[PDB]
């Protein structure tokens, strides 16, 4: 908060100004990028604590491990990774040898994989027969699925059977869905997978970081490779922040929040459809913009000028170049965190359509900016 | 501070209590582990900021990069790693391929073939080993600074066998920034460091490199060093780098060196032997054999008296590795919280008092009370 940040103001005016600019950006924009969120003051205070000075499991780390195990029903957990990528790579580093074969189920999908360090084979997404055939041909040591497995409603039990039949581990990256899974909205892969990775930010609404969940059989292999003797001191301040976020996620309020996220996304989608858009039980949607004769890139820019943040995104059979696109992808987690409910979701849908219908018209952009300002003033992120 | 961490108190009493307990531990102990320090309120506030919500280079990251390049005269920098060891891995895995040979010089075999040169410096013998094993990369670390290795000469040896030269300066980076120790950057392909320790920043790492290596370092997928940055932590790094550029930081390092000199001289007056670190250093290794106490026993007894040190083997140590005949200790942390030469001398005598009667309850209690007077006078954070 104000007093704490004031400690930066006179020692480093440039960094103070950058922080203040970002605070303003977060307050003044309606953030609809589906991976984005606003973590709590408690989370931030934990990672702003004196735990940064700290270098036989620390109480803070045991709390984080115990809570994340509880949240997902996992047999074991490692909370040391500093990112989703570090979590995913950490599984490969721990469990595999150079040149081992990894089979990804993809739509960097489903995770980024190094062709220098591994033999990476991809199954394009479902056809369980074709996946099993490919697995038998390539004999992967590990099969990995990600966001697309959730979006496409993959049967994780069935996938686990396929992995086991060819002698492969099954890994699932649930980062894009972790908060919803914790709330029971989406199926939990943990009972079925050997490894489940996630970010601690995004729909889990925690600090930036990662976690590896694993069956107890793989606790030692994971922890014998992912520990301070090899990767150096973990960030115990960030681990404390993870613990705080996991306690929040265990609460009934968090379940209600995720239900509100789903409902707000439904209302937003329904409003866009009423306003003539096409939508290609979720927190995220892909909007086909072609009926409004605007590209994804132009829509992203125009919405941005109106203080509404989205990402351009290719649609299926997109007629535009991949750096142009015919779509935008947008989600409800962040607007829900700052207090928007169904009425506000519908307002946002209408503001979006207003911009798309006249994207470079100055008066339209000004009116929408003013309506956005009413919303952001009434629903501040941080008080 | 109190208002900020108060936001945790009712939402997560268990974590709040753990934080309070750690705050008390930092306050109530004299920390002499040479790698430990206390970073500034500004650094903490940066990494406690809303930058955690933020997902072309961000102004914050460009400031961090530019400042660390300025601090060390580096051609390029990557400020992404989250520990010293992770900075090191970020070089190995970006620049090498599976099975490549790394030659370490010092006092992961699944991934690389590691050969070790054991450390007056025998450059010919190091060169001979390098010619036999043809390492793709030679790494020097803390022992290279402690032993006064000639980095220009080591760079020539690396070139002569076809190896990159990497130097890990984590244990000396703050001294190097202040001009007290030689800077390896002009001579090495890669220089890695922690941002904490003697640089007194947030916990993290940095890779410094010659300009031609910026792209391969930044692009590596494996093992997940790159590819999801913590912009709040990067802002904290930037703050620490601005601090390190200041004349005040140089004065701090001069005080660190002086306090270590006083500590060492006091311990010698009390009948201890300094193996290494007696002059021009923040760190020293104490040979305890004259006091007939193991490093393990010394660490434990000093800990009971609220003085924190690490046991550490001495050269030719007769004790088991978990036991040892020495302790390693340093002045950075005590200097940060305001101790000067008078207090450094007092600390030296308190240490000796414990070493001389480690099993005597009255001695431990007496020293503990003296330690409490010092820690109360010299709080870490106000």
Q: Which domains does chain A have, with CATH numbers?
A: 40-250 (3.40.640.10), 251-383 (3.90.1150.10)
Q: Whole-angstrom Cα distance, residue A22 to residue A239?
A: 24
Report chain B residues whose CB lies below 8 A from the CB of A118. Answer: 222
Do residues B173 and B192 touch, judged by C-beta distance below 8 A? no
Q: Which residues pair with B78 in a beta bridge?
A: B207
Q: What is the CA radius of gyration of chain A?
A: 22
Question: For residues A278 and B342, what is the distance between their CA atoms, to the nearest angstrom?
Answer: 76
Q: Is the peptide bond before A110 cis (omega within 30 degrees of 0)?
A: yes
- Cβ contact, residue pair B47, A48, below 8 Å: yes
- DSSP letters, B76-126, are EEE---SSHHHHHHHHHHHH--TT-EEEEEE--TTTSEEEEEE----HHHH
| Three-state DSSP class for residue A329 | strand
Distance CA B374, CA B260 (A): 17
Resolution in A: 1.4
Chain B: closest CA distance from residue A5 (Å): 6
Interface of A with B in 224-243 (CB under 8 A): 230-235, 237-238, 240, 243
The span from the CA of A252 to the CA of A245, in Å, is 13
Residue list, annotated binding site of B: 55, 84-85, 107, 143, 228
- CA distance linking residue A38 with residue A333, whole number of Å: 9
Partner B contacted by A359 (CB < 8 A):
no
Q: Which residue of B55, B204, B205 is in closest CB contact with A35?
A: B55
How far is it, in rounded angstroms, from Cα A64 to Cα A46? 12
Specify whether the CB–CB gap between A338 and A326 falls below 8 A: no
Assess contact for A111 and A173: CB atoms under 8 A. Answer: yes
Q: CA-to-CA distance for B155 and A361, rounded, in angstroms?
A: 62
Find residue B194's DSSP bridge partners. Answer: B205
User: Which residues of chain B lie closer than 8 angstroms to A248, CB-CB?
Assistant: 11
CA dihedral A152, A156, A159, A164 (to 10 degrees): 160
- Chain B nearest CA to A34, separation (Å): 12
CB A3 within 8 A of CB B1: yes
Distances (CA, A) of A68 to A92, A205, A295, B39: 21, 13, 41, 29
| Distance separating alpha carbons of residues B182 and A82, to the nearest angstrom | 32
The experimental method behind these coordinates is: X-ray
Tell me the residues of chain A between 66 and 85 that have a Cβ less than 8 Å away from chain B: 81-85
B382 contact A CB<8A: no
Nearest by CB to residue B83, choosing from A4, A98, A231, is A231
Out of B53, B85, B194, name the one closest to residue A37 (CB): B53
Q: What is the DSSP letter of B164?
A: E
Beta strands per DSSP E along chain B: 30-31, 76-78, 101-106, 113-118, 137-140, 164-168, 190-194, 205-209, 273-276, 283-287, 307-308, 310-312, 326-330
Strands (E), A92-226: 101-106, 119-124, 142-145, 169-173, 195-199, 210-214
């Amino acid at each position: 908060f104000d007093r704490a940040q004031s400690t930066i103001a006179n020692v480093d005016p440039e960094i103070f100004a950058a922080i203040e600019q970002e605070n303003r950006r977060q307050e003044d924009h309606i953030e609809l990028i589906a991976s984005e969120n606003y973590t709590s003051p408690a989370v931030m205070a934990a990672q702003g604590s004196q735990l940064t000075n700290k270098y036989y499991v620390d109480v803070v780390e045991q709390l984080a491990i115990d809570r994340v195990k509880q949240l997902f029903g996992a047999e074991a957990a490692n909370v040391q990774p500093n990112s989703g990528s570090q979590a995913n790579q950490g599984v490969f580093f721990a469990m595999l040898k150079p040149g081992d074969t990894i089979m990804g189920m993809s739509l960097g999908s489903p995770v980024n994989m190094s062709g220098k360090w591994f033999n990476v084979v991809s199954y394009g997404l479902i056809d369980y027969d074709a996946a099993e055939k490919l697995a038998n041909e390539h004999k992967p040591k590990l099969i990995v699925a990600g966001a697309s497995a959730f979006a496409l409603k993959i049967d994780f039990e069935r996938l686990a059977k396929i992995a086991k039949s060819v002698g492969a581990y099954l890994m699932v990256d649930m980062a894009h869905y972790a908060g919803l899974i914790a709330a029971g909205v989406y199926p939990n892969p943990v009972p079925h997978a050997d490894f489940v990775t996630t970010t601690t930010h995004k729909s889990l609404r925690g600090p930036r970081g990662g976690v590896i969940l694993m069956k107890a059989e793989y606790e030692k292999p994971i922890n014998s490779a992912i520990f301070p003797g090899i990767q150096g001191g973990p960030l115990m301040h960030v681990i404390a922040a993870k613990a705080v976020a996991f306690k929040e996620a265990l609460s009934p309020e968090f379940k209600e929040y995720q239900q509100k996220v789903v409902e707000n996304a439904r209302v937003l989608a329904e409003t866009l459809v009423k306003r003539g858009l096409r939508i290609v039980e979720s927190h995220v949607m892909l909007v086909d913009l072609r009926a409004k004769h605007i590209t994804g890139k132009a829509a992203e820019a125009a919405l941005g000028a109106a203080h509404i943040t989205v990402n351009k995104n290719a649609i299926p059979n997109d007629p535009e170049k991949p750096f142009v696109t015919s779509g935008i992808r947008l989600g409800s987690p962040a607007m829900t965190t700052r207090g928007f409910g169904p009425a506000e979701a519908e307002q946002v849908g209408n503001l979006i359509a207003d911009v798309l219908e006249n994207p470079e018209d100055a008066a339209t952009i000004e009116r929408v900016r003013a309506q956005v300002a009413e919303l952001t003033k009434r629903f501040p992120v941080y008080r």
